[PDB]
Design a binder for this molecule. Structure first.
Ligand SMILES: O=C(O)c1ccccc1O
Ligand SMILES: O=C(O)c1ccccc1O
Ligand SMILES: O=C(O)c1ccccc1O
Ligand SMILES: O=C(O)c1ccccc1O
Lengths: 213, 211
């Protein structure tokens, strides 16, 4: 049944999603359905809405404003933005003050087709105009960049904690008031009742849902 | 007038390019041109050739055979593909044999609009069939994924070497016959004499060219 499938599922997610969702998913699949193949793609890859409609993309994961309307969507968890910097930073402290946040230099991330791109506008509207020497499209490059510079960054908490040891970095709670990050699972009405889709949806829900309350 | 420039330069490069190029560039810029901004994008974002022509993208860095004719270029350095897997993998050995390579499960990297996209085809044509359990679009997530699974991957060596300690990975010379990876810097002829472009190109050559 589930054990036997050799179906390939295609999943849209960010690079954080790849490092976060893939290892436990692979571990679960080796226990439960060891022949299933998984392919990922970034939320910006083509025509996400069209590709979910046609069935080329089975599921989408993340903070995804594109799909806020015509799609089924289930919340997996919430987490916050934190500030991150190298463990031996010459001046950065935790907790970091707004003043210090505005004094330091930043690397920014433009996560295309995600809601993370609201961050710069939200800070700007609060009067926090960062000295941002570098802007990159995506998140994982942030680890090595912070490891070998005095830059700081604003990043999702669940990504940050995964960088602390590998890249020798520390986090601070974020001095600015930023909304919570809702990481959701999305699917198109067409596959609402497809057995294989429901099974993979249920697995994501089981593996990744916040113990709510 | 480098020190006073507030120019934003738009650079096309991979996730590997960002981790490798950006920290020394960041350090040089703080010292020579602290008001310059650098914005990156992937080689696959929009269409590279037109954007370099328009000055939408100033410079491209990486393995980019589509720019190999009709663009200016300088070689920065060369390196090879290697096989990478977690240090305590139950069976994977270094050096890995081609037989073992064909037996183990892989994480593939599709790698669009770079030369790395060709790996699947050189292997497939040579008759080296891989059991591809997981496919991702880009390289940089391979580090965390190998660390926490039993998969193996084929990856650029200079990238692989930066993963070894952070993620507890080992490498092997690659059992298959694969081409060298030439990492070049490219620009369009139109900006050949643009002063800010010349200045930044020359900074990349200074910091990264082994030639
Ligand atoms: O921002 C995301 O896409 C994300 C994905 C998985 C886990 C945490 C995250 O912030
Ligand atoms: O349609 C499938 O191949 C399938 C896959 C996983 C679980 C249940 C299924 O029917
Ligand atoms: O593949 C790349 O684009 C690359 C870039 C910088 C250093 C090593 C690399 O392989
Ligand atoms: O001439 C410019 O516009 C310029 C900009 C940045 C760095 C060096 C430069 O000459």
């Amino acid at each position: 049944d589930p054990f036997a499938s050799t179906r390939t599922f295609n999943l849209a997610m960010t690079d954080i999603g790849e490092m976060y969702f893939m290892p436990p998913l692979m571990e679960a699949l080796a226990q439960r359905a060891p022949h299933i193949q998984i392919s990922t793609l970034r939320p910006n890859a083509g025509n996400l809405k069209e590709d979910m409609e046609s069935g080329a993309v089975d599921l989408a994961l993340g903070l995804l404003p594109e799909l806020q309307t015509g799609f089924f969507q289930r919340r997996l968890f919430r987490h916050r933005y934190v500030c991150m910097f190298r463990k031996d930073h010459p001046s950065a402290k935790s907790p970091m003050s707004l003043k210090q946040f505005t004094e330091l230099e930043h690397v920014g991330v433009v996560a295309l087709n995600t809601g993370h791109g609201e961050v710069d506008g939200l800070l700007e509207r609060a009067g926090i105009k960062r000295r941002m020497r570098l802007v990159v499209p995506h998140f994982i490059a942030i680890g090595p960049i912070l490891h070998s510079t005095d830059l700081i960054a604003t990043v999702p908490q669940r990504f940050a904690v995964r960088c602390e040891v590998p890249f020798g970095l520390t986090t601070s709670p974020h001095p600015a008031k930023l909304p919570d990050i809702a990481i959701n699972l999305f699917w198109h009405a067409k596959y609402n009742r497809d057995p294989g889709n429901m099974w993979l949806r249920q697995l994501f829900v089981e593996l990744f849902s916040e113990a709510h309350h």
